[PDB]
């Protein structure tokens, strides 16, 4: 839950335990497994982001700063993902599971970000892949990450 003396030594140990290449780094294909043996638990997409980016660049290796970096984020709370899902619910005045330009227009005002039905309507289309003019926790995570 924090980078405390013991905690640091905890994952730092589990870090050198997976050191294959020996370049002071561990293969990305081991990070997830490292997050399993540890109280860590990111999002499928996240672990895929690193493995995919590092997939073909440096045999997929990680540094103490790389792992501890993500651990720093998760430790800060749990995953920081719940914060976005929460805003999604807010932006969703209905319980249907999707958001409409109208709802989006009402909430943004609640927060304090005065927006025009046009600017946000566009942000919805850019996030709407399936094609329904509505936003789901998935389409939401995408557009919000653009902030």
8's CB contacts (< 8 A; 6+ apart) are 68
How many residues comprise the chain? 147
Nearer to Ca ion, 53 or 126 (CB): 126
Kindly state whether residue 128 participates in binding Ca ion, applying the rule CB under 5 A: yes
In order of 43, 57, 81, 104, the CA distances from 78 in angstroms are 11, 29, 8, 27
Q: Smallest distance, Å, CB 43 to Ca ion? A: 19
Window 95-124: contact mask with Ca ion (x via CB under 5 A): -x----------------------------
**Could you give the 3-state DSSP secondary structure of residue 26?**
strand
Q: In terms of C-beta density within 10 A (0-12 exposed, 13-18 middle, 19 or more buried), how is residue 2 classed?
A: exposed
Q: Which is nearer to Ca ion, 10 or 128 (CB)?
A: 128
Q: Of the two residues 77 and 94, which places its CB atom closer to Ca ion in the complex?
A: 94
Does 30 participate in binding Ca ion (rule CB under 5 A)?
no
Q: Which of 41, 146, 147, 138 is nearest to 85 (CA)?
A: 138
Q: Considering only the stretches 12-20, 21-29, 45-53, 89-97, report the one whose residues sit in contact with Ca ion under the rule CB under 5 A.
A: 89-97
92 binds Ca ion (CB under 5 A): yes
Rounded to a whole number of angstroms, the minimum distance from the CB of residue 118 to Ca ion is 18
**Is 132 marked as a binding-site residue?**
yes
Q: If you search the block for the tokens 């990450």, which residue do you land on?
A: 145
Q: Which residues bind Ca ion (CB under 5 A)?
A: 92, 94, 96, 128, 130, 132, 134
């Amino acid at each position: 839950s924090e980078l405390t003396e013991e905690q640091i030594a905890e994952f730092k140990d589990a870090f050198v335990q997976f050191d294959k290449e020996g370049t002071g780094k561990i293969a990305t294909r081991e990070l997830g497994t490292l997050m399993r043996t540890l109280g860590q638990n990111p999002t499928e997409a996240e672990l895929q982001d690193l493995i995919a980016e590092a997939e073909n660049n440096n045999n997929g290796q990680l540094n103490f700063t790389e792992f501890c970096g993500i651990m720093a984020k998760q430790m800060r709370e749990t995953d920081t993902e719940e914060e976005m899902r929460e805003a999604f619910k807010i932006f969703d005045r209905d319980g249907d599971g999707f958001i409409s330009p109208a709802e989006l227009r009402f909430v943004m005002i609640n927060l304090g970000e005065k927006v025009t039905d046009e600017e946000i309507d566009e942000m919805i289309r850019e996030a709407d892949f399936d094609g329904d003019g509505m936003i789901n926790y998935e389409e939401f995570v995408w557009m919000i990450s653009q902030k």
